[model samples]
Target: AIGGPFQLTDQNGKAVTDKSLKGKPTLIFFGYTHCPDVCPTSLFEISEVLRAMGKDADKVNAIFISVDPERDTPATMKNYLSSFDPHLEGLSGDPAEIAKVITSYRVYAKKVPTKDGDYTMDHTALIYLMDRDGRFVSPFNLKRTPEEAAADLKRYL
Candidate 1:
């Protein structure tokens, strides 16, 4: 109930789907660049985990999908990911595809309007860990040491 196929665009402007998960486990997170705190820290935590993973990092995939497609264009996605681990792939697509990814992952996001008529997204904050065979494994826990977290992920790699 927590997993399904996906055909979305990566930050590099390439097509990626369940096919990309063929030979490796994937770490997936949904958030937007406009995020103020949690998202940035989550990305850093994942980056630290990857760093702790050492060479085995290449054996897996960590992806960040935009929950706010309205403003997170391809260029924006690319620019945003420059600060993180190279293994992290940021994915985004049209509204329809974004909705599909949200449904498949059971992610929730809502746009709340500010007093000035601006808006901010309130999205689900969870790291999804999918096995090498492309099935939902569980919500990857990040409340521990980087090495411990990496070790947990490598169990499937």
Candidate 2:
């Protein structure tokens, strides 16, 4: 329930809120689109999981919440999520707003030096499942397939 009531913007550049998720079971994953390793792999698994669900995928919402808002532009989010399913939404915002969302989820994220003004973010990689009420339910482990994720979600749903 902590991550609810958040204030942010979506990949479509539309203002979003927890109210935006009313009536559906939402799968919220916290990570930046710029992430190179775990993020892409995890999203690929999520995509496959949605595909496994077929039509039921429309009843679920999968979101990628950006940790590195400075680099994860709305355009990047749009392109990054296009490879996945249309049901998946990408959200990004200023550091303060991003920090608020991370805090709401009780997740940690911080910038680490890379080169010049460029840097990578360290953040949680778990896939979070929320009920239709937008309350925390469970999480899909790092290695589970999207089918397994969807199956787990079905049990919860």
Candidate 3:
């Protein structure tokens, strides 16, 4: 019930679809690059998960899909991702495409206007773990040691 399909572009401009997600376990997070705290913190934790997985990390797909489509161009995603793990990819698409994926995943996102005429996004912060065939596994919880997390992920392989 938690899984659905999507068509979007990765930070490298490669089209990413449900088909591409078919052969490997994928870790997905929904957040904006402008998030002041949780996004970076969770991404850093994901980097640790990658490191913990070691060579096994390559067997998985770690993705960050933008909830704030307006300011998260492919170029913007590329630049922002440079500060995180290379194995972690950023995905963004046209507003309609983004809206579709967010809805499919049951994620919530909203734009909050700021005093300076700028805006920020309020969004869901759950990490989804999907199995090789693109079925939802569970909400990825990082309460264990990184090694333990890796072991859990390894089980899906």
Candidate 4:
């Protein structure tokens, strides 16, 4: 399976486990708040899909898992996610726990040094669509318009 047991803290500092994600189809993305481009772009795209879904968006789960837990604490995630959709849940945990999650999801993430003595992350950028039962469905297609993506997501509901 692409996903397995995971216990992570949400942006609100609440525990969110794999069991918590059951009963609703989930859109899962892994990235860090410090990401310069892909993370923000993908998150914005997801926000549009959720917006197109309207009230029905509540029936689905939009999760952002931070691959850089060293910097992306619950509070940081909360603040960063506020710029995007309210429905997007940001998840983070201790490095060990986060490692387990990335391993289970087969995500590749690494720390890259920058010339400015700062650092950035290199991580897999893909949106995973899981069924209501928490089974991996596919790499979600975000190439379409938000309305089209929203309509396709509705079928899984």
Candidate 5:
């Protein structure tokens, strides 16, 4: 009930669809590159889990979907994600496509004005865990150690 079809551009300017991510359990997060703290922290924790998985990491799909597509072009996503796990794919699209995907995923995101007149995104921070068949498993837990998280994810694989 949580996920459905989507057509979004990846960090490399490649097309990515929900079908393309089949055949492996997927870890998905929604946030913007300009997020002040939570997004980076959560992404780092996810990177740790992927690192702990080692060679097995290739067996899963780790994706970051941009909630602020207006400023997160494919190139911007590529540059922003360079600091995290290389296996983590970043997805962005035009506003309509982003709206569709976020709706299908039951995600919440809104733009708020900052004190400097710039804007920031307020979005859901949950990490979605989808099974190989694209079924929503649960909100992935990141409170554990990387090794423990990797072990948990391996069970889905």
Candidate 6:
């Protein structure tokens, strides 16, 4: 139920579907760009894990899915991830499109109230690892190292 015959957009504004999951395992994160804390820290941590994979990292994909569609456009997503490992990807879309993705993955996100455009989004930090077939295979924690995750990816491969 958390997986899909799904479609979303990449940082470069390309459409990515379940078809893109072929021959590669994917680790997806649901977060936003304006996020003050958790998002970058967690993603950087994931990048660390991905980087630790070395050559094996090429075979896997780390995806960042923005829950804050109102502000996270393809360009914004791309810029936000610029500091991280290049092996990682960032994805976002229209509200409906992103809702489809978040629903399919059971990722919960809600924007908390703020004085201005600066608001906080509370969300599930579950980093999902899907096998090549797009099946939800594992849920990595916020603290799990990249080596810890890569080991599991190796097992799946």
**Tens-digit lDDT string for candidate 2 (46-134):** 88888878889888788889988788878889988887777778898888888788888888788888887767788888888788888
> Could you report the Cα RMSD, in angstroms, for every candidate shown?
1.2, 1.7, 1.1, 0.9, 0.9, 1.6
Model 5 accuracy (lDDT, Cα) = 0.93
| TM-score per candidate, chains pooled | 0.95, 0.90, 0.95, 0.97, 0.97, 0.91
lDDT tens digits, residues 1-157, model 1? 8767788888888888878767798898999878878888998999999999999889998989999988887788888888999888888888888888889889999998887767789988989998888888889999999999998998998
lDDT (0 to 1) per candidate: 0.87, 0.80, 0.88, 0.94, 0.93, 0.81
Per-residue lDDT of candidate 3, residues 1-157 (tens digit)? 7756778898899998878878889899988878878888888889999999898888999999999988998898888888888999899988998988887888889998898778889888878999988889899989888888888988888
Query: Alpha-carbon error at 112 in model 5, in Å?
Result: 0.8
Give per-residue CA lDDT, model 5, range 1-157, as digits (tens).
7988899999998999999999999999999989979889988999999999999999999999999989999998988889999999999999999999999999999999878868999899989999998899999999989999999999999
Which lDDT tens digits does candidate 6 get at residues 72-119? 988998899899988777887789988888788898898898886678
Worst 10 residues of 2 by lDDT: 140-149
Residue 127 alpha-carbon offset, candidate 2, angstroms? 1.0
Assess the local accuracy of residue 53 in candidate 1 as a C-alpha lDDT between 0 and 100.
91
lDDT of 4 by residue, 79-156 (tens): 889889999999999999999999999999999998887888999898999999999999999999999999999999
When 1 and 2 are scored with lDDT, the better candidate is 1
TM-score of 3: 0.95
RMSD of 6: 1.6
- What candidate 3 gets wrong by more than 4 Å, as runs, is none
Q: What is candidate 6's CA lDDT for residue 157?
A: 62
Off by over 4 Å in 2: none
| CA displacement after TM-score superposition, residue 93 of candidate 6 (Å) | 0.9
Better of 3 and 5 by TM-score: 5
